[PDB]
CSV table of C-alpha atoms and ligand atoms in Angstrom, one decimal:
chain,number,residue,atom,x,y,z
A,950,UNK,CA,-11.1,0.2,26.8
A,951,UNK,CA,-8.3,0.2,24.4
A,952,UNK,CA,-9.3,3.9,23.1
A,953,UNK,CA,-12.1,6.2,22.7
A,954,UNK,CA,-14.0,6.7,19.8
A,955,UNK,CA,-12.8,9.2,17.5
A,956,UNK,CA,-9.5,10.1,18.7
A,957,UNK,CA,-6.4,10.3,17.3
A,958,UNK,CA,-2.6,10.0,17.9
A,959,UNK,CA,1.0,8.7,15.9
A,960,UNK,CA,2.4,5.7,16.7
A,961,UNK,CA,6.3,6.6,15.3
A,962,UNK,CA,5.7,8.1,12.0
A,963,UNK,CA,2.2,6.8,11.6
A,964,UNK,CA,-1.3,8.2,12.1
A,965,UNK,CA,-4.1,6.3,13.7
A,966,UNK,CA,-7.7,6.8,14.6
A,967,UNK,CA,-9.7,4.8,17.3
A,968,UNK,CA,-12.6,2.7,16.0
A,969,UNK,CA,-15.9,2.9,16.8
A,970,UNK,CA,-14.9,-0.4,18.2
A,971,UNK,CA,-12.2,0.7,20.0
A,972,UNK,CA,-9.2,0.1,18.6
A,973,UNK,CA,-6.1,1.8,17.0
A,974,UNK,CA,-6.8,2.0,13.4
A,975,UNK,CA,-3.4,3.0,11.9
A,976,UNK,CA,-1.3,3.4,8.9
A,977,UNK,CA,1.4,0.9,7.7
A,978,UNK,CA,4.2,3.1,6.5
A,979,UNK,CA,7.8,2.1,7.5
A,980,UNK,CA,9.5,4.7,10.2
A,981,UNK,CA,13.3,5.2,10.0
A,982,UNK,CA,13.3,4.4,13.9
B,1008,UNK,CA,4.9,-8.8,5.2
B,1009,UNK,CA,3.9,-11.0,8.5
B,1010,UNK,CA,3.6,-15.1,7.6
B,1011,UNK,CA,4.7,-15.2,4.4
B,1012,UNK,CA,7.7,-16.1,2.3
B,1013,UNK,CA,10.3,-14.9,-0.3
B,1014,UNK,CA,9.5,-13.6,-3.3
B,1015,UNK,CA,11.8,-14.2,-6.8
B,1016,UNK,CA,13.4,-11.3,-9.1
B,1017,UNK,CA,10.2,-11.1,-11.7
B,1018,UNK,CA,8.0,-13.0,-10.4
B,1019,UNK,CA,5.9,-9.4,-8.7
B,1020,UNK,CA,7.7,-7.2,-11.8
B,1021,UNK,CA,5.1,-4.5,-11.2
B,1022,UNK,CA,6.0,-4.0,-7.4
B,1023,UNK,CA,7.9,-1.0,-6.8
B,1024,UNK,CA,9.8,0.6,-3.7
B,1025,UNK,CA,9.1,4.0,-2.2
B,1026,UNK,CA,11.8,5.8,-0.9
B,1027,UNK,CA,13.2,8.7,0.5
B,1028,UNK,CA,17.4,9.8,0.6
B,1029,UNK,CA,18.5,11.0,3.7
B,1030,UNK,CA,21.9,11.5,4.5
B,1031,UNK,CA,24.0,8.1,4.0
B,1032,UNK,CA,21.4,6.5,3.0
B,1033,UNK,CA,17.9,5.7,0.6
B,1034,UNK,CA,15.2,4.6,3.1
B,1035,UNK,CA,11.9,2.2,1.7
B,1036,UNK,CA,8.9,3.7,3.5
B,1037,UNK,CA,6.3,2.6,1.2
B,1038,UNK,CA,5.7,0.4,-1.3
B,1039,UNK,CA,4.0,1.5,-4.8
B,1040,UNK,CA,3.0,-0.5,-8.2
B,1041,UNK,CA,3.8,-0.2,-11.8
B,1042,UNK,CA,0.4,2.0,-13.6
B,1043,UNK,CA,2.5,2.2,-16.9
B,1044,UNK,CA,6.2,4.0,-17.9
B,1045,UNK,CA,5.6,7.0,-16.2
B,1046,UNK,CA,3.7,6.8,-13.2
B,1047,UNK,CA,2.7,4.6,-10.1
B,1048,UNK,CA,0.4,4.1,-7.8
B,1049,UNK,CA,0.6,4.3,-4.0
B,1050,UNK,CA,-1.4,5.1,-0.9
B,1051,UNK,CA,-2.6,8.5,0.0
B,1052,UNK,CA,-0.7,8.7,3.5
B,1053,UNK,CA,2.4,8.1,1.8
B,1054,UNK,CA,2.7,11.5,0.3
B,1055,UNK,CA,0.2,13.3,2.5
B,1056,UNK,CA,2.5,16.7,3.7
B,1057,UNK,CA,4.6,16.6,0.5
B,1058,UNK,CA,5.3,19.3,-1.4
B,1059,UNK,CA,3.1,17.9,-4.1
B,1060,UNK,CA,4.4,19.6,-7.2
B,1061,UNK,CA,7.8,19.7,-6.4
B,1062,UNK,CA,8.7,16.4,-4.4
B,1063,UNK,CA,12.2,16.7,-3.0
B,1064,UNK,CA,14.2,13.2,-2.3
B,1065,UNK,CA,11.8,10.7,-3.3
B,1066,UNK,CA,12.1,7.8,-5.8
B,1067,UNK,CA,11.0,4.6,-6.6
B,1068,UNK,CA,13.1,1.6,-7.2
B,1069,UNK,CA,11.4,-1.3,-9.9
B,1070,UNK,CA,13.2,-4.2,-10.8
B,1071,UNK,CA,14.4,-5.0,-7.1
B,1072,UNK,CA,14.3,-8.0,-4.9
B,1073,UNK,CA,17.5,-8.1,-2.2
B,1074,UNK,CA,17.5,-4.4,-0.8
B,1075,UNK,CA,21.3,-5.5,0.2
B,1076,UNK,CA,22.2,-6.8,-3.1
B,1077,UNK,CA,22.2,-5.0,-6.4
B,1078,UNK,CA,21.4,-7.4,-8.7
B,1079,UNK,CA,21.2,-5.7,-11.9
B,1080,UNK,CA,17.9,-5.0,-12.8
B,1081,UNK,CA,17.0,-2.2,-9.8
B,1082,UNK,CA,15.9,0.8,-12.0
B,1083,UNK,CA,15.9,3.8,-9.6
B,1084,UNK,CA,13.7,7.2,-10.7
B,1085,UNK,CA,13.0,10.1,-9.3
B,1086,UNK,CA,9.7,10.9,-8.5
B,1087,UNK,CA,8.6,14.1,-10.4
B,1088,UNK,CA,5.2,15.0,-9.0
B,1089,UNK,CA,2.5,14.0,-6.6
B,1090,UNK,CA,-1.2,13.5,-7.2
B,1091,UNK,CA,-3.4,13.3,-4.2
B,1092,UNK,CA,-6.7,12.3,-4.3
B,1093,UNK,CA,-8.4,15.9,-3.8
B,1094,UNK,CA,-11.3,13.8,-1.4
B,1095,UNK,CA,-8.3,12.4,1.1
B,1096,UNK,CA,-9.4,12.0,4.3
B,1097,UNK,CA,-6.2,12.3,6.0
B,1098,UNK,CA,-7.6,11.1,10.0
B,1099,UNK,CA,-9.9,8.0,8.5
B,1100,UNK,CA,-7.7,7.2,5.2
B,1101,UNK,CA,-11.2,7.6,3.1
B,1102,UNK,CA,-9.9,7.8,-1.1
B,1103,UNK,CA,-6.3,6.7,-0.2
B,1104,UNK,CA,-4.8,6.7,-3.1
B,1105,UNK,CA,-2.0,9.0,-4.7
B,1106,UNK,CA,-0.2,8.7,-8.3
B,1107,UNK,CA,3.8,9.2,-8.3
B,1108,UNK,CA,4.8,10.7,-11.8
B,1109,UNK,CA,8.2,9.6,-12.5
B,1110,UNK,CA,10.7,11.9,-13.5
B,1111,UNK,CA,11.8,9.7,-16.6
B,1112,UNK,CA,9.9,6.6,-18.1
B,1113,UNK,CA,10.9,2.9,-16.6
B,1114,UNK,CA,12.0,0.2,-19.4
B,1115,UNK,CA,9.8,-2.6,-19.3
B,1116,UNK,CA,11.4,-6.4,-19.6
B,1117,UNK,CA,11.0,-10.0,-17.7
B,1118,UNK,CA,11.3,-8.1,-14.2
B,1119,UNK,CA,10.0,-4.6,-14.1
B,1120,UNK,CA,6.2,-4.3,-15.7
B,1121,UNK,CA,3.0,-2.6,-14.8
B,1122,UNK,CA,0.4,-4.2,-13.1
B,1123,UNK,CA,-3.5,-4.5,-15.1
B,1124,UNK,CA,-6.3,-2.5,-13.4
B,1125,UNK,CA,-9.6,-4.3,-13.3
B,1126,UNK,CA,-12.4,-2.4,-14.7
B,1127,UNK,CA,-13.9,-0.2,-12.6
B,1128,UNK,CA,-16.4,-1.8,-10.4
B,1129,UNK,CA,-15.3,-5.4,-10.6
B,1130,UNK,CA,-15.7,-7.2,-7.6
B,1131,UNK,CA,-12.2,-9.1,-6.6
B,1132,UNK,CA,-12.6,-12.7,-5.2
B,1133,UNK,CA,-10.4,-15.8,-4.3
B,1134,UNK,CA,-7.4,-15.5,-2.4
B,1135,UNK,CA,-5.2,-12.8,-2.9
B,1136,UNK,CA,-1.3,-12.0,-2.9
B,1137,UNK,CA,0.3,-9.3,-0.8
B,1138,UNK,CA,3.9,-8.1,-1.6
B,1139,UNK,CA,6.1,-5.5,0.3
B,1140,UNK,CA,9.5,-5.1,2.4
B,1141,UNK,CA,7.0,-4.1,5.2
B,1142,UNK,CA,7.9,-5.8,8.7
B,1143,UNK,CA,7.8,-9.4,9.0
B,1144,UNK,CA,6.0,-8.8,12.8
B,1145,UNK,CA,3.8,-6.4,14.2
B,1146,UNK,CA,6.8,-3.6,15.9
B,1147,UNK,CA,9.5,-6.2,14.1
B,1148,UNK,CA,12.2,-6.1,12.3
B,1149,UNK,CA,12.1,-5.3,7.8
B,1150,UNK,CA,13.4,-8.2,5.6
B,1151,UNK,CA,16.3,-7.0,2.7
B,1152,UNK,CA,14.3,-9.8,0.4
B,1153,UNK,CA,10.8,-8.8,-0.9
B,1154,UNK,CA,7.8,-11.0,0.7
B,1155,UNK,CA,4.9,-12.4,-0.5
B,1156,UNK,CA,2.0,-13.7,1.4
B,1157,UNK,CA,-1.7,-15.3,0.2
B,1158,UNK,CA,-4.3,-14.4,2.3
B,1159,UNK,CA,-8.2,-14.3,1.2
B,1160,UNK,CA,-10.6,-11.5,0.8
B,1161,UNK,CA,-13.3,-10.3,4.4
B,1162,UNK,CA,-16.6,-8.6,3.5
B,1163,UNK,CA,-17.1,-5.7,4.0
B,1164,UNK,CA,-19.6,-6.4,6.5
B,1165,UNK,CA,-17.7,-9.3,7.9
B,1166,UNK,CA,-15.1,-6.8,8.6
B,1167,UNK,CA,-17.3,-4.3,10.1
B,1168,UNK,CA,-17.5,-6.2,13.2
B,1169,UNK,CA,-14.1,-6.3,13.9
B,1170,UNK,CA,-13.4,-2.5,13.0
B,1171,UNK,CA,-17.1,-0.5,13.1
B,1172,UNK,CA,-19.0,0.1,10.0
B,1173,UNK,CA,-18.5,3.8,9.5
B,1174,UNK,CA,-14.8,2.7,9.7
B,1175,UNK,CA,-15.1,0.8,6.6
B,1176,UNK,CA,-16.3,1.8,3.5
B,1177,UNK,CA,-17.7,-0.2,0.6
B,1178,UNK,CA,-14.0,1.5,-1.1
B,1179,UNK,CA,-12.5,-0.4,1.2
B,1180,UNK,CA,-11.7,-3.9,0.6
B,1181,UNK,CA,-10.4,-6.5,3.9
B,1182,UNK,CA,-7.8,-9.3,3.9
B,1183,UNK,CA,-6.4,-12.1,6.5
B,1184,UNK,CA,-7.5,-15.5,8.0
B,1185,UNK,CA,-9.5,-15.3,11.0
B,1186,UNK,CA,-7.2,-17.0,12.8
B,1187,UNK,CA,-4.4,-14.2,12.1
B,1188,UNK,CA,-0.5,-14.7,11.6
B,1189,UNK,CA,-0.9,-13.3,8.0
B,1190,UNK,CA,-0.8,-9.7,6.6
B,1191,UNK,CA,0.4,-6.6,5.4
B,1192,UNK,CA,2.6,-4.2,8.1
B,1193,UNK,CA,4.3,-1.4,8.6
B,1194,UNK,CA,6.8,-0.5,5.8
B,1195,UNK,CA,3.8,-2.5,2.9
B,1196,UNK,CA,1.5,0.8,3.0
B,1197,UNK,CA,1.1,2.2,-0.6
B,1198,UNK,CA,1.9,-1.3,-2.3
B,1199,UNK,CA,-0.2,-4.3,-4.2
B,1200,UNK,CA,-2.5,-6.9,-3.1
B,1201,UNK,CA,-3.6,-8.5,-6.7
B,1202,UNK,CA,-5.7,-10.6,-7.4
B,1203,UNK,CA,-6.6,-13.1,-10.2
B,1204,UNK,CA,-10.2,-14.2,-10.4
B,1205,UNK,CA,-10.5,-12.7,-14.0
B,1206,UNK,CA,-8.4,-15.5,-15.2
B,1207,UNK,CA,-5.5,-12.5,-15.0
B,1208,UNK,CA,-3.6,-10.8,-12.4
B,1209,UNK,CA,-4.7,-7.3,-11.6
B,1210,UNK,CA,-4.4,-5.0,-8.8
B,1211,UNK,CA,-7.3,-5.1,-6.5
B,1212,UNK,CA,-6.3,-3.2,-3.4
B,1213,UNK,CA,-3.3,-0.9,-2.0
B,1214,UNK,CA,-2.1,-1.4,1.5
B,1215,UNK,CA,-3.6,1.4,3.6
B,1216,UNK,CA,-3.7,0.7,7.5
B,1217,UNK,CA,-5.1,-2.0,10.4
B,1218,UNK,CA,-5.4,-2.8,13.8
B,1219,UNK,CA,-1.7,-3.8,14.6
B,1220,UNK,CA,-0.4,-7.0,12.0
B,1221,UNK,CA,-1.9,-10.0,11.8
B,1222,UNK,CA,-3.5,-10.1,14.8
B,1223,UNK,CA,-6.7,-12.9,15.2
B,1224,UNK,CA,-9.9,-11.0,13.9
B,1225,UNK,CA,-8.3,-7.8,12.6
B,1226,UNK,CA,-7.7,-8.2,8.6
B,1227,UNK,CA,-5.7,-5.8,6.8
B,1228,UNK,CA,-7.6,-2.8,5.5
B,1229,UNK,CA,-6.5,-1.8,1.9
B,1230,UNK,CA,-8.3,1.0,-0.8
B,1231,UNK,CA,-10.0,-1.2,-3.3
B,1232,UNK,CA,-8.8,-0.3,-6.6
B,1233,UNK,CA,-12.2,-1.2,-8.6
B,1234,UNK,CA,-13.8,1.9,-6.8
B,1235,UNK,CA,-11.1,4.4,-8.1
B,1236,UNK,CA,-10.1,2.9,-11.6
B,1237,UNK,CA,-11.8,6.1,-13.2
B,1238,UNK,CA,-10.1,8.3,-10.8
B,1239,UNK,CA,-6.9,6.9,-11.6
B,1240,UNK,CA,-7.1,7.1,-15.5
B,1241,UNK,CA,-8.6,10.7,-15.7
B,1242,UNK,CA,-5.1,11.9,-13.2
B,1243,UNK,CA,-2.6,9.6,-15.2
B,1244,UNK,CA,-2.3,12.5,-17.5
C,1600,LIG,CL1,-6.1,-21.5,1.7
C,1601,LIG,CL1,-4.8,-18.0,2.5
């Protein structure tokens, strides 16, 4: 439903955390990719 | 920086680069923001995993505007030490806020200056100014020239329906127009929003993290600065 609540995971060199809404919460550092 | 449009050399002079030398090159993760001569202040997850005492390969860069231009007033320092807010919260970005101590001071003129703190507590208001070399799309591609965009201030609560209300904290402070195309991304963590409403600029939050860029109902999440104004003057020596 997008994520579950509570989990995490990277996306490239950031970190994210699913919302109690269920989305991808995640950092906005740049990633030399 | 998604939606906005070039800045000009002094017009942000407290907005600093983050970066980190690799061979053949000096890569801009982060951004950061003039505190005073000897430190700045970014976001926790930009230093999270450093060796905080003895940073190896990091500087900042003040004074720029054209990362493929030296124009003459780029000041590049290494950074000395990192301070960490002990309370981090590495997963949910709870206190994310570090200071950078600079390994010599900055000199201060028309381009390169810090950036007021409001007093602790203050409550930002009116529209607000994000700066960074952060992408100009969500998964796009990262500008040379420094962006700026306006964009106003969410409530807190406002903001909890897009993103759960454990998942922000009064600390937190939201930004971006309901109807999206506007925001902070990926290569703006750790640098300014400021704001104004004190008849004065002053920094109000630090890019920390979001739901993609820009997207319709998903405002940029940044640590607001009035919470940790204390914090940050007891750890800048
Ligand atoms: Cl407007
Ligand atoms: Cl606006």
């Amino acid at each position: 439903q997008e994520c579950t609540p509570g989990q995490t995971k990277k996306q490239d060199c950031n970190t994210c955390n699913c919302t109690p809404t269920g989305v991808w919460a995640c950092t906005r550092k740049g990633c030399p990719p | 920086i998604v939606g906005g449009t070039d800045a000009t050399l002094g017009e942000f002079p407290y907005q600093l680069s983050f970066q980190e030398t690799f061979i053949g090159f000096s890569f801009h993760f982060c951004g950061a923001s003039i505190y005073n001569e000897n430190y700045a202040i970014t976001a926790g997850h930009c230093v999270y995993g450093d060796d905080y005492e003895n940073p190896s390969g990091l500087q900042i860069v003040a004074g720029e505007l054209d990362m493929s231009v030296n124009e003459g007033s780029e000041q590049i320092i290494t950074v000395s030490k990192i301070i960490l807010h002990e309370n981090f919260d590495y997963n949910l970005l709870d206190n994310d806020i570090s200071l950078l101590k600079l390994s010599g001071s900055l000199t201060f003129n028309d381009n390169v200056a810090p950036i007021a703190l409001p007093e602790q507590g203050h409550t930002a208001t009116g529209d607000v100014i994000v700066t960074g070399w952060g992408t100009t799309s969500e998964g796009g591609n990262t500008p040379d020239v420094l962006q700026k965009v306006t964009v106003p201030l969410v409530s807190d609560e406002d903001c909890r329906a897009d993103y759960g209300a454990d998942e922000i904290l009064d600390s937190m402070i939201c930004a971006g127009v309901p109807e999206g195309g506007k925001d902070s991304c990926q290569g703006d963590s750790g640098g300014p929003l400021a704001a104004s409403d004190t008849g004065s600029t002053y920094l109000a939050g630090i890019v920390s993290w979001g739901y993609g860029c820009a997207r319709p109902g998903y405002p940029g999440v940044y640590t607001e600065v009035s919470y940790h104004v204390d914090w940050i003057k007891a750890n800048a020596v």
